[PDB]
């Protein structure tokens, strides 16, 4: 259209003109430029020439239009008609309202938790403090590891930030919050299409007292393949810049050499650094393995101390450290090395609490617990249950029990938003003690055995896993090392192989050949030369860790590539994210373009759209909230496009959405008619 405004001063005519344009919402036009023409001081001066637009450069430096609700309409539109991936297309169910605890932001600003301690004494002071505490310090895994195990890591940021206040007050005496890394980088940008950095930043703001902890893989940080050291540093600094303060560092084959580069970065950044031994085997069974003995675990701790880690941590990623094994392992570790010990288990045998209470007796300093309603099975032991279990025993778990129950009740209702993604695991699986299948593997591997038509032949797949372990030496079962032993167990049962058979016919499994090249590390048993030779059939077996065969990445070119592609301003987080996960970031950006920030929608609306005649309020954040009412969808018109009659912020709107569900020779009543 054309817009005319008027005032007593050319400026006020210009001010009026400006807002008349933004208030003018036509949801792709000249508006941003013309607004810049108004706020152009050269215009206001009242003297220009025909070459006013050509002369001035950043007139065209328009800022993108606040499409906003028109995009939010498109999303709720597309999902309401065509559903959401991996979710049974059902009308948006009726969940409970689940009122949420809050705590004054001024009061939470009064707390002085264990981040204050890192801001007063260094990392070494935080570690030397933990030692002194007689009480049991707890790390909480609800924001990260608990829902990775139980809900395919689908828990969205909106559900975390909405309790962040109470969580910051409940775990105010807690060591750390586990919230980032693991698989929360990949699943966020790709599945929930939400930025993990904003999960980090928005939580760091809301929870400023407790330390923030993540799970960092030594080989590749949060990546999927192998990376040059140059990128391991970049990512570690930027997470450190954004609030991460406790980096747990593990390697899939307990190989210290790969953990050194991810280590120099955490020292450099000045945060806490957890060197971790991943636990395999049975310390109580002498006949189970001659490699992973109590001597090995005490050696690695001394190795882990010499390499300069601030806390030694133990990761029972398959629930294989039995209650009595916990008692000896930690107590024998506690007296040989002088770091605090950070124990982490998964309650797959149902003995997770029994591991801990034993572990506390041997004097463990920090334990990994999840809130009750998100605990048990392939998750962490219940913090709630544990607190009461130490009733009567000398040691006490430093936490806010009544605050945890409130945190449990909230998470109990919230989880039902995510019931589409529940694991199939309903009960403890005590036979992990044989096959050593990691968390959610003896179920995930069963669905893959069914694919090959081995679904009812699972005894021979379970047994093959345990055989495959011994076949590759005695190795550690954790991603990616668990994937190779997995893929290797199907293969031999796929075409009827055994131990000596796979060597004897070898010259006649993409992960396995990647493994025997050493592309994931160097095993603590080495390789079997005869076994090795037949799998890769002759190429370069890596003679050192994978990182040093890799050229450092030029992050300046990446910044150029993204700036040409995107609008312009590319931040460092944008950079390392593209480097670590190219396709997903690229895809995440395209999705960000179409639909805006979906990390703001309530989790049900994110997953189900809305139903006919329902109203939905969205926190655009802090006082700004938009209200949407779905009136009706139409039948598909001549094409496959339906008309959704909307009501947003009082103004009626409509969106048109693609529905997914001679000449001619026609037939009318069994009669072949031709045009």
């Amino acid at each position: 259209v054309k817009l005319s405004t008027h005032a007593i001063s050319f400026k006020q005519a210009e001010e009026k003109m400006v807002r008349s344009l933004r208030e003018m919402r036509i949801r792709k036009t000249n508006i941003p430029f013309l607004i810049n023409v108004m706020k152009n001081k050269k215009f206001t001066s009242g003297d220009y020439t025909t070459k006013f637009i050509e002369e001035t450069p950043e007139l065209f430096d328009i800022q993108p239009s606040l499409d906003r609700g028109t995009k939010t309409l498109e999303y709720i539109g597309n999902v309401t008609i065509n559903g959401f991936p991996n979710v049974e297309k059902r009308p948006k169910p009726d969940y409970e309202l689940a009122s949420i605890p809050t705590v004054s932001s001024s009061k939470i600003a009064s707390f002085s938790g264990t981040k204050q301690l890192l801001d007063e004494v260094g990392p070494k002071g935080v570690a030397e403090w933990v030692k002194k505490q007689d009480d049991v310090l707890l790390t909480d895994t609800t924001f990260r590891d608990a829902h990775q195990s139980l809900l395919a890591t689908r828990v969205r940021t909106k559900d975390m930030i909405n309790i962040a206040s109470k969580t910051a007050d409940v775990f105010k005496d807690g060591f750390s919050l586990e919230m980032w890394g693991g698989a929360t980088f990949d699943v966020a940008y790709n599945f929930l299409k939400e930025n993990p950095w904003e999960r980090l930043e928005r939580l760091r703001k809301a929870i400023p007292n407790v330390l923030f902890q993540m799970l960092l893989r030594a080989s590749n940080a949060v990546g999927y393949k192998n990376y040059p050291d140059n990128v391991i540093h970049k990512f570690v600094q930027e997470s450190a810049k954004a609030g991460i303060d406790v980096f747990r560092i593990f390697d899939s084959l307990n190989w210290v050499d790969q953990m050194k580069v991810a280590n120099e970065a955490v020292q450099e950044a000045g945060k806490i650094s957890e060197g971790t031994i991943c636990y395999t085997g049975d310390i109580l069974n002498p006949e189970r393995s001659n490699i992973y003995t109590l001597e090995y675990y005490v050696k690695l701790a001394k190795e882990l101390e010499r390499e300069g880690f601030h806390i030694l941590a133990i990761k029972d990623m398959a629930g294989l450290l039995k209650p009595k094994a916990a008692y000896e392992l930690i107590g024998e570790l506690k007296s040989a090395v002088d770091l605090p010990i950070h124990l982490h288990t998964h309650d797959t045998s149902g003995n997770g609490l029994l591991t801990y209470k034993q572990a506390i007796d041997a004097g463990v300093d920090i334990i990994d617990t999840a809130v009750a309603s998100m605990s048990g099975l392939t998750s962490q032991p219940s913090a709630n249950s544990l607190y009461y279990a130490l009733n009567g025993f000398p040691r006490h778990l430093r936490t806010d029990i009544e605050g945890m129950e409130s945190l449990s009740h909230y998470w109990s209702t919230v989880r039902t938003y995510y019931s589409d993604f529940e694991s199939d695991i309903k009960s403890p699986n005590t036979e992990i003690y044989q096959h050593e299948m990691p968390g959610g593997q003896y179920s995930n591997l069963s669905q893959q055995a069914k694919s090959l038509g081995l679904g009812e032949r699972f005894d021979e797949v379970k047994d093959m896993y345990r055989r495959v372990n011994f076949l590759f030496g005695d190795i550690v079962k954790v991603t990616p090392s668990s994937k190779v032993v997995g893929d290797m167990a199907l293969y031999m049962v796929q075409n009827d192989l055994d131990e000596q058979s796979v060597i004897t016919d070898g010259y006649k499994p993409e992960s396995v050949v990647s493994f025997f090249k050493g592309e994931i590390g160097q095993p603590v048993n080495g390789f079997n030369k005869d076994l090795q030779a037949v799998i890769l059939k002759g190429q370069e077996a890596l003679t050192a860790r994978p990182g040093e065969y890799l050229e450092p990445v030029d992050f300046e070119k990446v910044r150029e590539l993204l700036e040409e592609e995107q609008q312009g301003p590319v931040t460092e987080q944008d950079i390392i994210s593209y480097v670590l996960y190219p396709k997903v970031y690229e895809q995440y950006i395209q999705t960000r373009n179409q639909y805006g920030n979906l990390s703001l929608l309530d989790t049900p609306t994110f997953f189900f759209g809305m139903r006919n005649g329902e109203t939905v309020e969205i926190e655009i954040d802090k006082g700004k909230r938009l209200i949407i009412k779905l009136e009706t969808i139409s039948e598909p018109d001549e094409n496959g496009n339906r008309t959704i009659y909307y009501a947003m912020n009082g103004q009626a709107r409509r969106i048109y959405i693609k529905d997914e569900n001679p000449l001619l020779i026609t037939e009318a009543m069994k009669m072949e008619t031709t045009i």
Binding site: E15, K16, R19, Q651
Partner: protein, 94 residues
């Protein structure tokens, strides 16, 4: 000087002041009653708050303290009373 302004009114004059306030780059808080939740004026502002669910229509635009809470809670510098509600209420201005 006046970062963010709140209008203790509704409808035509509230929409009016919200326009002049935007023109000078001022954020605008609106207030609305239960019976006014579907008003035009509550969507023209940068923020919006129901004064009191307990308070009933006319009271929601006439409770001095229930309004001022909203203002303080929202980091307000100035209140424009519009015309007719509290525009002439010496004690409100106090």
């Amino acid at each position: 000087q006046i970062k963010k302004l709140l209008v203790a009114n509704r409808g035509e004059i509230a929409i009016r002041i919200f326009a002049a306030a935007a023109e000078l780059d001022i954020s605008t808080v609106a207030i609305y009653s239960n019976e006014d939740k579907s008003s035009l004026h509550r969507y023209k502002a940068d923020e919006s708050y129901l004064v009191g669910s307990d308070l009933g229509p006319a009271e929601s635009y006439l409770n001095i303290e229930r309004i001022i809470d909203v203002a303080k809670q929202a980091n307000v510098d100035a209140i424009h009373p519009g015309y007719g509600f509290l525009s002439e209420n010496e004690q409100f201005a106090r």
